[PDB]
Amino acid sequence: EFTTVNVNYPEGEVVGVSVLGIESFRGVPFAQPPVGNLRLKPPVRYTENIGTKDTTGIGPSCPQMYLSTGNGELLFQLVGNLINIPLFQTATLSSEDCLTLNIQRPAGTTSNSSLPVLFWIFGGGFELGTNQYYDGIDLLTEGISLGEPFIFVAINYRVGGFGFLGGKEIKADGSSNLGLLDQRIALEWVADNIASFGGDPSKVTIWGESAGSISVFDQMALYGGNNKYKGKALFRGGIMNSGSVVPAAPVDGVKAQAIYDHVVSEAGCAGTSDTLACLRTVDYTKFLTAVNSVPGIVSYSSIALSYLPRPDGVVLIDSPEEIVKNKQYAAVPMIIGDQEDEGTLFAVLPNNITSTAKIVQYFQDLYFYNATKEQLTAFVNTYPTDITAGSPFNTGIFNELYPGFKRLAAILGDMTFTLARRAFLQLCSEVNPDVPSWSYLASYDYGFPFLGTFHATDILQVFYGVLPNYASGSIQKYYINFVTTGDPNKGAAVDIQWPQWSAKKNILQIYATKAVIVADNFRAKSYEYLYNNIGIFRI
Numbered sequence: 001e002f003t004t005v006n007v008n009y010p011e012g013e014v015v016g017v018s019v020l021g022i023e024s025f026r027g028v029p030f031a032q033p034p035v036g037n038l039r040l041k042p043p044v045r046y047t048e049n050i051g052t053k054d055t056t057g058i059g060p061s062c063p064q065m066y067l068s069t070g071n072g073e074l075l076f077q078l079v080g081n082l083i084n085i086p087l088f089q090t091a092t093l094s095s096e097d098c099l100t101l102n103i104q105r106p107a108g109t110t111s112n113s114s115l116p117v118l119f120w121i122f123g124g125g126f127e128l129g130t131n132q133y134y135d136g137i138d139l140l141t142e143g144i145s146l147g148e149p150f151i152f153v154a155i156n157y158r159v160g161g162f163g164f165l166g167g168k169e170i171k172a173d174g175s176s177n178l179g180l181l182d183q184r185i186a187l188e189w190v191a192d193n194i195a196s197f198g199g200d201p202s203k204v205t206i207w208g209e210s211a212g213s214i215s216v217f218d219q220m221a222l223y224g225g226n227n228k229y230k231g232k233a234l235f236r237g238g239i240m241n242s243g244s245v246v247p248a249a250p251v252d253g254v255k256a257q258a259i260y261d262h263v264v265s266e267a268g269c270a271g272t273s274d275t276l277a278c279l280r281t282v283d284y285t286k287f288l289t290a291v292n293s294v295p296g297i298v299s300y301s302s303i304a305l306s307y308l309p310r311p312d313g314v315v316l317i318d319s320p321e322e323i324v325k326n327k328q329y330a331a332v333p334m335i336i337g338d339q340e341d342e343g344t345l346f347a348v349l350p351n352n353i354t355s356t357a358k359i360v361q362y363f364q365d366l367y368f369y370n371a372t373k374e375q376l377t378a379f380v381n382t383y384p385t386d387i388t389a390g391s392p393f394n395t396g397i398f399n400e401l402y403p404g405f406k407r408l409a410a411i412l413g414d415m416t417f418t419l420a421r422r423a424f425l426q427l428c429s430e431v432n433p434d435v436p437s438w439s440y441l442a443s444y445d446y447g448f449p450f451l452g453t454f455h456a457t458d459i460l461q462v463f464y465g466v467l468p469n470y471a472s473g474s475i476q477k478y479y480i481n482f483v484t485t486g487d488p489n490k491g492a493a494v495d496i497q498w499p500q501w502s503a504k505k506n507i508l509q510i511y512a513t514k515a516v517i518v519a520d521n522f523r524a525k526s527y528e529y530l531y532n533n534i535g536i537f538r539i
C-alpha cells in the first residue's frame, strides 16, 4: 500500500516513501559530517551537490550518553509501562555522521505548495536523544483532517561532549555551543530548501520539549536575537513544552573547564601542546568513553547537568535571563507550558536529600556557585516540609517515596521549569508587551503513583494520534491552529478560548477529560524569591 517519491532540491535529490497518505524523507543530510577535523567544530553547509540520497530508512542518530541503568533501577520501575516514552528509549545507528533531518508531508504536496512548517527539536538533557523516535504521520494526519495541512521537520543536533563541551580552549577556538549551531544551520537549510518540498519558509514554527524547549528559547536568543538569514526571519513562532530560560555560568567557567579537563585526561590527551587539536585525533571509541565518563542526568547530581548551553559572548552573548531583560532575543508569538509535576522524575535518585539543610548543601555543592547559604535556605524555606504541600501536587499524604521527596521534587520542578516559565512570561511581557503568548499547565496524569503528571508525559499526548480523551485532541488542535495562524484559537473551531497570558496572567489547565482556566500565581512566595534573585540561580 505504498510507493516511493523523489524530490529534487538545490543541494541534491532524495528518495522518500509514501504510505498512509504521508510522504516521508528520513535522513536528509543538512551539513557536512562533523568528523575528522570537523569534530568539535561548527557545522558547515555542503559546498556542492550530494547527488541522489536514499532516505527511505530511518536516519542515523548522534552519539549518545545513554541513561544509567544501574542508577535508574527504581526510577525505571516507577515509570512502569511509560518506559516506552522516547526519552527512555535507546537510539539506534548512532554515529558522528548524524547531521540529518526528516521531512514529512501530505501526499499531493509538490514544490508549488506552500504549507506552514513545524520544526521539531527533541529533548534529552543535552546528552542524549534523536529525531528517530518522533514520527509526524499521526500528527500530520490530524492536521490534514482539521483542514490545516502542514509540513513536519525533525532534526538531529549533536549532544553531550560532541555538542556542548566547553572550556577556555573551546571558547578561543570559536567552538562553543555546537549543538545550538546545529539547530541554527538546519533552520537556514530549511530556509534555503524547504520550498522545493512545498513548505513556506516564511511560516516556520519551532517546537521543542525539555532540552528541545530550552533550545527553542536559545534560538530566539541566538546572536543577540538575530534570527535573520539572508534578510528574512528563520521562524515566526515558538512552542515550548517544559523549559525556557536556563540561567548559566560562562562556557569558560569553572564547571565547564572542569568537565573539559576531565575529558582531556580520559581521552589520553593530557599534557599535549594543543589539547583541543589532539582531541580530534583520538579514535571515536576512546573519545566517546571520555565524554561519557562525566555524570549523567540519571545520577545523584540529577539536573545539575554536565552538558548544556553556556554563554560564550557571540552565540549566547549573556546568561539567558539577561538576554530577555536586555530585550535581545527574537520576540515571536509563543506558546509555553509545563507538566504539573516537572520535578518528580529528578527527585527519585537523591534519596538522602531529606531536609532543608541537606537540600541547601546539595545545592551549594553541585548547583549554584553564586548563592549564599542564607539565600538558599531562604528560598528552600518557601517550601513547607508538610507532606501534603509537595509534588505530585494536590495528592495529600500520598506519594512520599522517601522523607522529603515531594518537597525536593517541588523545588527542582519549579526552579528549572514551572516557576522559571512564569518569570520568563513576566519579563517578556515587560520588554515586549505587544508580542502575544499563551501558557498551559498539564494535569492529565493526575494520580500516577509517586510521579503524578511528570516530565515528558506530554509526548504521549501529541505524537501517538488523537487519544480517546479531551486533552490530546485539544492540544493538537491548538498547536496546529498556531502553526497555521500564529494564534492557537484561530483556525479549526475550539471549545474554550485560550486566554493570552499578559491579559490577566491566567493560564489554561488541561486535565484528561476537561480544561479550566486558572491564575498563574500558585506558589507565589517561592516565585517571588526566584524572580527577585534569579542571578544567584546560575547553573
Ligand SMILES: *[C@@H]1O[C@H](CO)[C@@H](O)[C@H](O)[C@H]1NC(C)=O
Binding pocket: 300, 352, 353, 358, 361, 362
Ligand atoms: C548523599 O549521598 C551521596 C552518595 O552516597 C554523597 O555523595 C552525598 O554527599 C550525600 N549527601 C548528603 C547530604 O548526605
Ligand SMILES: *[C@@H]1O[C@H](CO)[C@@H](O)[C@H](O)[C@H]1NC(C)=O
Binding pocket: 248, 249, 250, 253, 368, 369, 370, 538, 539
Ligand atoms: C558569579 O557572579 C559573578 C558576578 O558577575 C560572575 O562573574 C560569575 O561568572 C558568576 N559565576 C556563577 C557560577 O554564577
